């Protein structure tokens, strides 16, 4: 049916998807809580323009192995923001409102000429807390602050967790620095690249932690909706994955890589040797692999056993070279020494190499 080595990965995928056949309840409760939250937020002057980013999608599972953890992003229209690049990092920016006649309700959140991530986050969390206290017959608990990117984490009953991330939306041109990225010209099209550039970009509150200090009011770029689009429309042929003749395995490769990372993080969660890694590194690495392998025949499902392996090698190569460019920002090094120490990188390299040399036993252990 397929090249040798497939059946094990296919069984892993089947178990993982079997873990997704009882979500309707969880997803429904998430829809309810998010809808309540949006109803309240739209009433505050500051948040009249909050909306669901992935329209008609009240979920996005970032952990393929955690079906009861959801990820949602609340977009905020916020027009005409002049961005000022923070200390040449290409990914973290200060936001300054440009001239606008109709008063913008985000004035209250200014700190001088800069829109303060802190104050916005504070108001956001206060509104969420007071609204979820209006949930009389369901214990929805707001988790304590940890950072700025996972703005709010809610716990429903004793099984559901939902991460709500607030994002500013800009309809304006993509920031000057972030141009040479999204190199899908030879994979999807140059015209699709142009069209995607026409789509808005987003800003998530994320402190840029420099060695000397972290600047509390800085924002990071977000193209996760673009990432979703390329993930769900991923082939050169427009009919990819819609028929038996054009069935690819790209999505399966991504899922298997994420499952590998999540299991390896779970086994070593208590030793803090993998804390710094996330699914985003593997998703960007996969997108690099799709860039290096643009043709759908290089992703034939029957070659799953091989294709995953090549992706693994690319990830391992990044781990050895301390270089993984953000797919939209070629000058943003996710794998630089300043964000992750060498020791954790060699640790992850060795563990994945062991797993690959032993037919991935960690997939079955827990």
């Amino acid at each position: 049916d397929a090249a040798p080595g497939a059946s094990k990965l296919r069984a892993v995928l089947e178990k993982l998807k079997l873990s997704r056949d009882d979500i309707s309840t969880a997803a429904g409760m998430v829809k309810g809580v998010v809808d309540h939250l949006l109803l309240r937020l739209k009433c505050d002057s500051a948040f009249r323009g909050v909306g669901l980013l992935n329209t008609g999608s009240y979920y996005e599972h970032v952990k393929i192995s955690a079906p009861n953890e959801f990820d949602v992003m609340f977009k905020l229209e916020v027009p005409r923001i002049q961005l000022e690049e923070y200390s040449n990092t290409r990914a973290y920016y200060f936001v300054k409102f440009k001239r606008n006649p109709k008063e913008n309700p985000l004035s209250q959140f200014l700190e001088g000429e800069i829109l303060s991530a802190s104050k916005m986050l504070s108001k956001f969390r206060k509104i969420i807390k007071e609204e979820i206290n209006d949930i009389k017959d369901t214990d929805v608990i707001m988790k304590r602050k940890r950072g700025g990117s996972p703005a709010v984490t809610l716990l429903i009953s004793e099984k559901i967790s939902v991460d709500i991330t607030l994002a500013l939306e800009s309809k304006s041109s993509w920031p000057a620095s972030t141009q040479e990225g999204l190199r899908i010209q030879n994979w999807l099209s140059a015209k699709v690249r142009k069209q995607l550039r026409l789509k808005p970009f987003y800003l998530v509150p994320k402190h840029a932690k420099e060695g000397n200090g972290f600047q509390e009011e800085t924002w990071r770029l977000s193209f996760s909706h673009i990432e979703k689009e390329i993930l769900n429309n991923h082939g050169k042929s427009k009919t990819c994955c819609e028929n038996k003749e054009e069935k690819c395995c790209r999505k399966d490769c991504l899922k298997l890589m994420k499952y590998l990372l999540e299991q390896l993080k779970e086994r070593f969660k208590d030793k803090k040797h993998l804390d710094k890694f996330s699914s985003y590194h593997v998703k960007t690495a996969f997108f690099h692999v799709c860039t290096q392998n643009p043709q759908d025949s290089q992703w034939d499902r029957k070659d799953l056993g091989l294709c995953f392996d090549n992706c693994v090698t690319y990830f391992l190569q990044c781990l050895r070279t301390e270089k993984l460019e953000n797919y939209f920002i070629p000058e943003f090094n996710l794998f630089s020494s300043n964000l992750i120490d060498k020791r954790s990188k060699e640790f992850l390299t060795k563990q994945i190499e062991y797993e690959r040399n032993n037919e991935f036993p960690v997939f079955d252990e827990f």
Binding site: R99, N100, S172, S173, K194
Partner: protein, 95 residues
């Protein structure tokens, strides 16, 4: 083979600054061109009227600043004055 002046390439450069992928069609080019001409003639005319009103013979940055504060409406006025002060100040910063 003469040299007719117009602000084509200048407006074009400001465009490439503010929208590195958006072009501009020759008719909208002409419109931006006549807009630059109109606003510049307004501002210089008001600067001239200021100068003659106070019996001066120089249009300095003071007169251009008061012209901008007279023509452009409120917020546009404040931001344009800031932009001009910054440019002039930077010009003084060089030699």
């Amino acid at each position: 083979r003469s040299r007719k002046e117009s602000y084509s390439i200048y407006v074009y450069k400001v465009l490439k600054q503010v929208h590195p992928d958006t072009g501009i069609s020759s008719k909208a080019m002409g419109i931006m061109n006549s807009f630059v001409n109109d606003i510049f003639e307004r501002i210089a005319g008001e600067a001239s009227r200021l100068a003659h009103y106070n019996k001066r013979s120089t249009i300095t940055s003071r007169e251009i600043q008061t012209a901008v504060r007279l023509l452009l409406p409120g917020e546009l006025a404040k931001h344009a004055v800031s932009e001009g002060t910054k440019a002039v100040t930077k010009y003084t910063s060089a030699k």
